[model samples]
Target chain A: LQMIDVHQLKKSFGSLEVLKGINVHIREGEVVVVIGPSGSGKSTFLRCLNLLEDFDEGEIIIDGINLKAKDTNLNKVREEVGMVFQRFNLFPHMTVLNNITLAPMKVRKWPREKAEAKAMELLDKVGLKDKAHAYPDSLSGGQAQRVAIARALAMEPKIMLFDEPTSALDPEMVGEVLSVMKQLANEGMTMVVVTHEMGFAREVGDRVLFMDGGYIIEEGKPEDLFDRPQHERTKAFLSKVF
Target chain B: LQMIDVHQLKKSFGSLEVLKGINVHIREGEVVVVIGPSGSGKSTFLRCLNLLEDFDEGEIIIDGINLKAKDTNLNKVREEVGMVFQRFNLFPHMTVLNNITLAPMKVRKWPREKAEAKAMELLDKVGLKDKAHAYPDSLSGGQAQRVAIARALAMEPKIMLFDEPTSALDPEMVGEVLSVMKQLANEGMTMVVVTHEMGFAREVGDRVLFMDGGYIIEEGKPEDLFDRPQHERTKAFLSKVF
Candidate 1:
């Protein structure tokens, strides 16, 4: 069964048509690492899929939820799709616990006690249970990102979207954060990650999507993509990372 | 020069030989993953490396600092080594920031301002700066573990040891913690990790050590260890992990 399907996805910013008729499908528990050069529409495509950015045309059905339709419940779709960004985008004034539980209580209509319990579990999942009452300003880049992840999981999303999740951390802290991601992949979470860590993509990703010039130029298993890429641009990228 | 050298290392618990004549050399910035089943003495090896459990014989040299020297300051030895465990062991009484700064001020004799600034900086590194004044009981597992990492980093350790860092997290949050570790590895932090997370061991680890019954049964590159084991025990373990 397809968990997320994108057909002829087209999006433009002013005169720039960044995602030109993109097409892809992700099945349940599938992990696809999206790779490409800067401004290759990787992040833009993900945002469009979650309706964080409105698309110009085509279809995106996530877990049978249509994204192209005008009446589609964007909030409902978002509730099932979690996205973690390069920069931690947490509510500054809120403590870690409040940050995670707010949406559950407000959007999902969960009770305070129930939402808090689930929040703690989500925080535990991200290894941040102890930061529940701490505000955003006190977080390290990685800790803030973890809190962001915890806040997203608090919604119990069906799939996760990561856009360069580790680009902003100090060198030594990256491994710890990536270690957490590895655990998630092992547990069979349906995730789509956009990252520059070729090692991570090769090891954790079930598939690799290579994009260039507003198109998914190639797609293959991680081994195939790394060891035997069929695309020229992909070879170029791999050479640089290696 | 080797960053950590273990020559003819041996350890026993009463009649049980937990580490049997182990020998390994880890260079600066090397990431080595130790893998084995339970009762394989993996934890003992780490404990011995961290000097939490003293070994009966053999040479243990870390960063040119010998562990068995008669007058060696164990405190000084500990300052250069950081360890993260399966469980988030934190002091219950202090605020999160205090947890990281306590040692720096008392042991290093750093001024409160200097210690606090460094603690906050490390907290930023792990993305938990906002959790500074929060209590441990409030942090999620991932967050707490991250704090533990920051606390260790506050001392400016030369090497890091992880024992199943994410075994206790939720299916979704493991990646967040690992992501931090990934940054550390990229920044050239020497690390030895004992984990069931084959994905991380394969992707981030520079080498893999397979142990059984207190002996390293086999060792090689992760691809070789996982795909082409040379020993029966390694093959068996690989079969189960893969």
Candidate 2:
């Protein structure tokens, strides 16, 4: 079954068409990476899926549920469709424990005890259980990003979206974050990532989508798309980054 | 002559001593990079240089001006020591142009036209001239950090301090910021950077200082410090990151 299905997605800011029509589909437990040049709407596409921004025209279905359905619960959709931003948006004022627990308790209305337990478990998974009481600002970029991932998982999301998660991390810190994501992939998490880490895309992503000019120009298995890209634009883009 | 001199610097938060007595010296137009483990007080030491944090005991001299001198103009000291933070800290409501111009116009009291012109020049240098009218939210993390750098330079400070400027940027964006810093280094700007980018430090820094327990554990030419560290702590630290 398709975990996420986005079709004819269109977004605009005034007259500027940021996301010109794009279509993407991800199967259950599949890892997909979206690669593109700057201003190519890769981020906008991820934002639309996470409801951080609304698409002007599109059909988005996640786990057989329509995102734009009037009867659809926005809170429920957010709970099941987690997003880890490029910036570790962990609340600075909150302790790591609270940062993880607040969303589950407030958004999902999980009981305090259940939320705390889950938060602890996630923190442990991120190798930050000892930092539970520390403020987000106290943690390093890598640690903060891990906390963010844990926070997202605290919601028990069915599908995870990473919008350039490792882009803002130090080179040494990038490995730790990628390791966490790889562990998630190993556990069969349905993830759609917007990233420029070609190695991560090629190694962990089941499929790779190349975007340019607000559209998907190529989509195929990672080896085929990255190693043997058929499209000129894809080849050019990969060459530039490589 | 040394642009900055620190002796026996000590700082603590509550019962935790973050910086043990540290000594270091930075020559004029020299680029220095400080690297250390978490809680090593690198940030606190940097903050102390700008008098943002009051050290328990230390003697700090910048450009022959004593920080402890009576009737010293601390504002002048700050004006000469511009800092770029990891968080970007750009005013979200203001356009990128205004973010660069406001400090110069208000604090330095430059005329609007002069501030705007200078802001434009710095923005161009950072390769974000086209993003002048865009809000902070409109730019990516890397672009925002570049804006922060431009904003700091807009103040026309004598020395620049960066606290992990690229630590908050994505992997794809780190190169852009490092390039800007490298450009500044080439232009002989006096800079002290607290970063984990060992490669940038080795390549650009005139001196590399390794801090641990709030003290300068090792300081030497980047090649010597990185390749042939004399301290066990430094070797252990380098091994973990390198």
Candidate 3:
């Protein structure tokens, strides 16, 4: 049950090659954690999964649709895949409830009452039902990020991609966001997370991939890779991060 | 000789405590690298050293001057310590030469001819002699950052403090800024740098300090701390960075 199948994916920024001939497969309900130094192309690789970034070469098939294919519908693939960023990109003008409900009502064409109902359910699950009518500016960073998670879930996407979701957060606020992500993983959400949170990776990741110089240098079960990385690069990378 | 010393440093943002009680001594010409997660108060601690951020309670002594002393002159202490920021804070309206000469001419009371000559020399040292006449907007990120360094050096400060000097730079541009800092270190500039560049920390730092929860969690030589961090928090911080 492959949800994502990438083959020899390559990306470059002008002359600098970022993602170089990468290959990976993410299975249904599988949690993959990607870790590396800054500028390791971890974020770029995640962005390419949803066609947010177009690669120079190779293939990315998300949920049976080839992203590079001319006739393939990108919006259709994106509807099935939800993305979360380091900075919670919520609409400032919208209330918490409206922020979550907008995507479903507009994209899925659900009625306002139906969308609002689903949004409330998500807010409750994230423990933010009381904040439904609150504006984004009024919320703390942790609260805002959890709302981002709930907003993404309102779409009911099959796969979730997190790009350093907690990196921009304050230390105290980080655990709350990770808790939401951990709960999502526990409920059988297929996710690919690029993060520096080694604790989260150790506890939630089924597989851990170490990327360096635009290549997946080594990957294995979280326990094995974290405890006994084979490559020198992986060992060097893990040494500083633990 | 101690260039900088602190006693029971404490800071807070309203009710939230940032730096609880930090104490450290930095020697002349010793390069100390500070590493921590965001909100761990590494930046705040650095900012406090130069009195950029006033602490609620603490005693900061730079070059034998007590920062907390009512009669102590802040400008005298600041004149002996040069600081570089992440964003390369150069005056946009000024040419590179004018930016460098402004501080020395205005504060140190150096004449125009002497200040301009010294600025040109510093610019050459940073490998930006050609950019002296150019405005900051015309320069690339790396170039602009180098100019910032040159501008700081024009004051001939005894100590240099870098608040993530290369954090805002592009991946390729980071090396150039780090190179400039390395040259300064080699020339016996007492420096305290807050950064995530582990390689630079290993290669150039005399000691590494791991800060967390408003405390100096661990401090030791780069080799010992990076390879065999004793504290769980230090090990955890190191693991995510390498």
The number of the candidate with the highest lDDT is: 3
Two-way TM-score contest, 2 vs 3, winner: 2
Estimate the TM-score of every prediction: 0.50, 0.58, 0.52
lDDT of 2 by residue, A106-217 (tens): 8778998899999998889889999997766567888988998998899888889998888867799898898899999989999999888888887889999888988899
Comparison by TM-score, 1 against 3, better one: 3
lDDT tens per residue, model 3, B1-242: 37999989999977989899999999999999999887788877877886766899878889888998899999888888888876525754347899899999999999999999999889888999988866565577789888888888888999898988787677999999999999989989999999889889999999999989899999999889989999998888778878
TM-score of chain B of 2: 0.97
Q: Which rank order by TM-score, best down to worst? A: 2, 3, 1
Better of 2 and 3 by DockQ: 2
Please give the range of 10 consecutive residues that has the lowest summed lDDT in model 2 chain A.
Answer: A86-95
Sliding window of 10 residues with minimal summed lDDT for model 3 chain A: A85-94
Best by TM-score: 2
lDDT of 3 by residue, A1-242 (tens): 38989999999978889999999998899999999997788877877886667899999988877997889889888789888866525754457999899989889999999999999999999999999976565577788889988988999999998887787577999999999999999999999998899999999999999999999999999999999899999999988984
Worst 10 residues of 1 chain B by lDDT: B85-94
Local distance difference test, each candidate: 0.82, 0.85, 0.86
The DockQ leader among the candidates is 2
